[model samples]
Target: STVPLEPWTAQQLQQATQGYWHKDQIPQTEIKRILTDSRHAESGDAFLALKGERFDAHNFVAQVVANGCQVAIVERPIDAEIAQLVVADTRLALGQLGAYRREQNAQLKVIALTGSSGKTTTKEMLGSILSRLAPTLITRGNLNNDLGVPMMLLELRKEHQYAVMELGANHQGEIDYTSKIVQPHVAGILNIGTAHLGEFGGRDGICRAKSEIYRHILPQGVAIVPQQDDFTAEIREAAKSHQIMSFGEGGDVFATEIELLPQSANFQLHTPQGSSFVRLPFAGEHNVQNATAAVAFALALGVSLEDIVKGLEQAQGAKGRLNFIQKAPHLFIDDTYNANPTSMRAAAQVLLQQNGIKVMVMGDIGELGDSSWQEHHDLGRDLAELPLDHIVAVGQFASAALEGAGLHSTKLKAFQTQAEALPFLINLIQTHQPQSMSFLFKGSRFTHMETLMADLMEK
Candidate 1:
């Protein structure tokens, strides 16, 4: 029901997607919602039948029409009895339709960002900052891909003044495709790291992939780049002719007099507009970079320094991304949503800031491909240098982490899975009863490290 009310007639939908209608005249039905899943279709919703690698949603066209869906957007006509909008490709059509909706609101300013890591965190932070300036809508719940992008755009309403979207890519051309649909007024390339190295070949490949977000920046748009990133020059090259703003330790918009605390961080945000002290209500030195990027982008959007400080002070980080929970005598850092080498190191940086026995309960990081073991080993080596009291390496690749940590400290343990690590971890907690301890839970999505956090919370 988030779809706007005006100019969404069936004929307009067909014209927007350049699709043929089954009937002589398109119905005057105004779609209240745009849907993909037939199971969730409701009355007045237009079902988009998308075909994917594992499933063919086109097969469910008849099912959705039977479920009170007035129209189905498909690659081909399914039945004459049902109203159909047929296009060459439903996925492309979805993007086109989203672009159509986006074009309807000339007052809306779109901000698109991409990075090797921290896309969601940056999106959340920017959303918090922008909301203070205008009615804002951000990417919802990891909907940063091709299909998810259009679905997010479909939620655009006339009253929304700003739309902040995160564009994620594991393959080449993905960001380019999505960015064209977004046509952002402000585009940000956060940083280049080895997130999907195998899929994109290597670091250079990752840099190229992340830079695609700037390909379609609207005229007079601004490009935000990280000043400290190794590929800053390449990003600037990609954002050729666009007004560029760099943010980092010594960039155009930089952080000064920084303080990285256990529960929060404080820094002076130095921007072209003005400077202000920003106190982020969260942990991590890496987040200072994220906050600086947000402030720089918000400044481009004409936000006041006073509002930026207010927004950063009130901003809460994304769930499972350095989200802290205090269970008396134990401080748990739940960063279990997903992980890569960069994010793992960032979490470790924050973990070392705590003034208690630092314990890192880690699981395997996914998507490093054949170099997964070496990546895990490298992370373990990096973590060993920290003032960590104990390291509980869990899962298969995590054994390498155990081996690497064992080289530094004898207080290293390994578990084949989270299930096996449960009893020992619980015992460790019980043994350290009434003693202040800080634990960091980190892993990939498959590792389900949050399950262990749930167990600890249950106790």
Candidate 2:
């Protein structure tokens, strides 16, 4: 082993993964990037040969060097001139590398959060706030799972003073592992909604699974919690290891003057430090809650009230979330990114508030398993309670939803597919000819409801 050329050396990789080289000699070459794909292997890159059920990247080890990869990290040494480090497991090695990189940055202040819903939006809001004070790294897209969390951590640089990471999981222990990797200074739960009802078995399990993010929060760190959640007590109990700061009405950080508009909302945010007027560039009361959650995280990190308000005002929430579109007689709200029982209701309320003859077009909410029927039915029944002019339910559970809207049957229709229901939707839009009609489209990612949204927009 000798001195390295780059910050990440072959010796450090071996130390991080607790791996050993094939030959006795340790390469002192500069390893620039970590490449998981063999196609992207090139000079100044160290290719990590990962193995999974379907395939093995170890087979590509001999080829990556020819493609110019300087080094390779694999479970077993392969025949190649490139420097090789043998580890027990490649997937685990990836996380280990990320954790090692995270530990290298002593200035990092991590804020970890998890929830069945609103976590991504809240993460974006918090990311916007932190980036103002210093260079910050926020989780990109839905990369918040065990592997995703580590990959985000791997990007940690010396200049990044803060990180806002979202922790997501389908089953137990996933969050536990990711939380250990993050070891955040402040962690929180946006809300324990019914997003993964099928995976967790019930709401109680969902609460417990989400609360796992609090596992790694230091005793001195604070846990920002949702005050109004059904499992507030359970979430609180699980997070009792740390100081708790609740957000939402009746919580330490809450909103006072909330005016919900079609595309956005104006609210007065009250936090431990002070109160400030925040114009959250997102609609719906649920978004206000998300804004409050972001506020709570920023406050816990000691961010000033002025920066919080400015960051929130300039915040651009995740795309396709409560996006309001106006095309003459039709107002389309594109919330088709994904949906569960909680988000579906929140979207519907926003649609109801928009000025027009309201229409709620929904696709089946997935991952409920046995409770799918009950959740869809309840959603339909609840949406029917609104003054919406039309309720269109599509996909496998479409009829089940309409069946639940038994009392308000006239305003509701169920379609097995978008193609079969497009004509009826077009007719409904034309028939009303309202001075202005608002249409809200929403469903799970599995449903491809965005296609329906595009189809309607084309008309």
Candidate 3:
């Protein structure tokens, strides 16, 4: 819930980052915290120059120093009297620092997961379960990347009893490096989906890339696997060095006799320790699986079933991951955080289960590359099978969705932009009044579907 506030001595920073003094030594000042963004740099902070896809913060080294940063970690030494630690890779150095911090407290039980879907939710579920027992550290927002993983580790405090880290990647071997730094006592790969299909080439490559998260689990640590994933065997092989725990149906931790509620679900939770009737306060059957994964992680750490069950009933969903908003006779499900084909289908299922009139507004699902057309088309075709009142296809993939609806084409409409769809949405909401109406808005991160949802909420 907070950043690393513990001060780091200059010598400690140098040793942890494997860095060297860039210039003539001056009186070493302690680092109050670490900052990646130059704009956030302050007098006592250490700015680590990071090279991202579009922008390189190495160019901002001078800027951060000007912003009163006491020290700068960079690829090349700049002209300055301040303490600068030069490293081979600042990003790698950041993780090494995190690993160093993690080593400082050997008592911390770290649990991490990587997947195409259910990552954020599973992390939240894990957070809920772990935090109830003691002070636990959890990754915040989308800060699950190589840089973010270590940033989170830096936040680790002496009081923390557990940490739930979420690892995300769009490229190969990213997980390999981060997982090694994490050296988690419990690690998992939730499910393989086409979230980053374009970046990884295809699903097979995606499987290899995601399974990297489980490869570095500490010896005798628990490796959590999805029982029903298409590449479960491969994942099992990847995690062969460690003790394996599986979640989902027929796994070590699973749910049975599920009764899906409008906003939540109740199920019989079966764990290695014991079984209990779980009341998960989240929508979608997928979230039930997420809860089970969290349960497995808690069990691996010897967390009691009583705590696990309490956590299940108490865990909250990550923002925009099926956040429900209700007005008299109107309900809106906001899942606009991000999307892939798998989540698209899952969200559709959740939308269909709502009472009375239901409408699903879909925007283009990104990162599909060559599969974009077919995926959207298939999503549209598959959605037609449901008895939804209407399907509004928005963005560049609208035509593909429209064409795929087949005989149900009349029930769907395509719009090139949110502006064009606004009037229709307004009219639909107005006409459907006096009867219960529900709307589910979803798309990839770039879609900004939340803007349209806001418009509906206002009008």
Candidate 4:
């Protein structure tokens, strides 16, 4: 079957997860689907009961079964009678299951990624290039978290010759856990920044946490690191045992001559084999980072330079990551995929560069622990410098962005909620005929920028 049902049997699951296997049994019930939150549990789905910050999945086992879920895997056995598998720790169990799957599939060329910026873009880029030759699957959405990752790893089948996984973390060892599960043949740490500075304390902490991607690298794996990163020197020295391939200007897989033209970008990618020219259809210097990561991974995986270029061109764009909305009076740049200071700045840079009536619709950035103020303030400062015709700030965090953009004294609109902002955006689009008006929708998942984007694109 194309989908490997029951890839993890109860016995295998128990062994990998360090759980007690009742009746010496493998799950006879074939689970064709995987789910995390029991609220969305469907029949024939293996529901993972995770004890999260807000809710405890262990408490939801009974409810999940009631919702037609075939089975539930929890951290502890429940007194309530239901079809469920219990493990000591759901988080560790998920990681263990993924690691076990990797150990079982020795031939898989796993590419692990983490950083403040460009992890998803890099994943998309690698997936696009790798899919040219082999069956490949990259993480869906921000499946870079502890629970999200195991479910993603369980998705890997025999047909998949390559796997590109995005590993993100707010605290320490998230990369270590994800990397061990991924055991990437080739790994990359995109860049370090003030992302999640609220939790890890600062950028230095981000560097340490993101660098954990290297800790789980296999003995002969390749480490593709960003050369211009503040912590690049540190990461390079740490990855001394492995093949460290740097990507950036003067890097192993780097861009020699760069140009960020109005319509597109032109850059020469320098690799160990030779040099190749790339002109991305989209506009963004951030895309250059994505291209560099993709080129490095392709080179390591034996993807020819020609195919790499062709693949990137064919790879149009992912949802919410700089997706151009053409349906109306106002042109929109939907960059709601996920939020971080690095990505936010990149989106702002693109909006500022575009020739038109520019407006930025900003949203909250989650996981910034304590440094949320400084990071948010920094965004406000950058926003102020963008020289936009207008700015719309939504969600609690965007208030800081409005301040950062120095639009406080001005009449820049600030909506308390996205619901309020969307209608206003539509009306402004209709009235102002911001035809050439370029808009940037940047936000955390909580901000619901996608729905706003969908509304703007519906017509």
TM for every model, in the order presented, reads: 0.96, 0.94, 0.96, 0.87
The segments of candidate 2 whose C-alpha lies over 4 angstroms from its true place after superposition are 1-7, 24-28, 59-66, 79-81
| True-structure lDDT of candidate 1 | 0.84
lDDT per residue (tens digit) for residues 310-346 in model 2: 9999988777788777787678888888899999989
lDDT of 4 at 341: 78
- Per-residue lDDT tens digits for candidate 1, residues 240-352, read 77998888877888988899888888887788887777778878878888888888888888888888888888887778888888888678999999988988888888999
Selected candidate, larger TM-score, 2 vs 3:
3
Model 4 C-alpha lDDT per residue in residues 338-368, reported as the tens digit of each score: 7887888778778877766888887878888
| Candidate number with greatest lDDT | 3
Ranking by TM-score: 3, 1, 2, 4
Structure candidate 2, residue pairs in collision = none
| Candidate 3 Cα deviation (angstroms), residue 390 | 0.9
Off by over 4 Å in 1: 1-7, 23-25
Model 1, position 422, has a per-residue lDDT of: 84
What is the per-residue lDDT of model 3 for residues 327-441, given as tens digits with 9 covering 90 to 100? 7678899999998999999999899779989999989999887888998998889998788898999999999998899889998999999999988999998786678788999
RMSD (CA, Å), candidate 3 to true, equals 1.6
> Over 4 Å off in model 4, which ranges?
1-6, 23-47, 59-72, 79-84, 261-263, 395-435, 450-459
